[PDB]
């Protein structure tokens, strides 16, 4: 098959390939990129989303989060504390500060070792979930603010705006700030652009193994699992690569550098950390292939106002011949995680 090793792939589009976003996503799926659950896309050298990052010092981070982490033997739970609002300027000064700055290191493996060794000490501040875009109005290629995929149907046909899902979010990171193991809301795709600063490292589990990771997590955290089946959607659970390896969960790792895109795929579990002060922009998107994942997604029961997207409009428009069955609860379709989105047909 295409990428039978399910290893994270990197792509280097020309400007002409880069211009149509949905089409290029269909292309990288025709190359098997989706099997890893994560892919890197390096934009053309000529392309920039913004001329300068030195005029954003006045941007407000309304709800910075201090990340407290408790655990041992590769298994941790992360607790957020909302701090008072601060500007990018203040944040940047705390991030580049000596008590929170990146430690000295040679190779990525050393930094990774220090991350997993020091995870629970000196809790950092994450500049997370900031509504906004650092793109300039005029940039029409891979603009995270408007990607023009079928996810837009939630807005255009239904008038529903879900912040960070069909709208962009900014993330100002510092060393050791983390994102816990999760798939996207409604098992959507996500896109992530690192605007500037130090790298972001990522771990990914192939969608075809996602259930193995869930059973693993349920084993380690039975109480959490008993309270909510989808408790990983709480984005509190950290699990080291050593534990993944010990229990035989296939995974891959990759480091994203400023100027690079990461794409996560439906039901791709991923987690990671920031190397130092940086800024990333992201949102969710969809393709036709997502619709079945959306229909099957297991959602958090226990919490108030979690993201729940009505699938009705999608089934109605793109699967009319299955709509009656689906409404009746009789749609028994089984997802094959290896298959590319239909749109890939012309490349295959």
């Amino acid at each position: 098959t295409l990428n039978p090793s399910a290893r994270i792939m990197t792509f280097y589009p020309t400007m002409e390939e880069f211009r149509n976003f949905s089409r290029y996503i269909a292309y990288i799926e025709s190359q098997g990129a989706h099997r890893a659950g994560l892919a890197k896309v390096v934009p053309p050298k000529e392309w920039k989303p913004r001329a300068s990052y030195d005029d954003i010092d006045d941007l407000v981070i309304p709800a910075p989060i201090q990340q407290l982490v408790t655990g041992q033997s590769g298994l941790f739970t992360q607790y957020n504390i909302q701090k008072k609002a601060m500007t990018v300027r203040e944040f940047r000064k705390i991030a580049n500060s000596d008590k929170y700055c990146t430690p000295r290191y040679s190779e990525f493996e050393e930094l990774e070792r220090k991350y997993w060794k020091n995870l629970t000490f000196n809790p950092p501040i994450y500049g997370a979930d900031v509504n906004g875009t650092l793109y300039e109005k005029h940039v029409d290629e891979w603009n995270i603010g408007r990607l023009r995929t079928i996810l837009d149907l939630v807005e255009k046909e239904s008038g529903i705006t879900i912040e960070g899902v069909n709208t962009p979010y900014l993330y100002f990171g510092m060393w050791k700030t983390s994102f816990a193991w999760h798939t996207e809301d409604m098992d959507l795709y996500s896109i992530n652009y690192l605007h500037f600063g130090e790298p972001k490292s990522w771990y990914s589990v192939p969608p075809e193994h996602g259930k193995r990771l869930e059973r693993l997590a349920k084993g380690f955290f039975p109480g959490s699992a008993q309270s909510c089946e989808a408790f990983l959607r709480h984005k509190m659970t950290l699990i080291s690569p050593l534990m993944l390896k010990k229990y035989g969960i296939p995974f891959d790792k990759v480091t994203q550098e400023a100027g690079e895109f990461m794409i996560t795929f439906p039901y791709g579990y991923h987690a990671g950390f920031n190397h130092g002060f940086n800024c990333a922009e992201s949102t969710n998107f969809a393709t036709r292939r997502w619709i079945e994942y959306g229909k099957q997604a297991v959602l958090c029961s226990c919490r108030k106002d979690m993201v729940k997207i009505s699938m009705d409009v999608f089934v109605r428009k793109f699967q009319p011949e299955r709509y009656k069955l689906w409404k009746a609860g009789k749609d028994n379709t089984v997802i094959d995680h290896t298959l590319p989105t239909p749109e890939a047909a012309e490349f295959l």
């Binding site: 979930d129 912040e163 993201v307």
Partner: peptide, 4 residues
């Protein structure tokens, strides 16, 4: 409802 939003992302968190």
């Amino acid at each position: 409802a939003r992302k968190s």
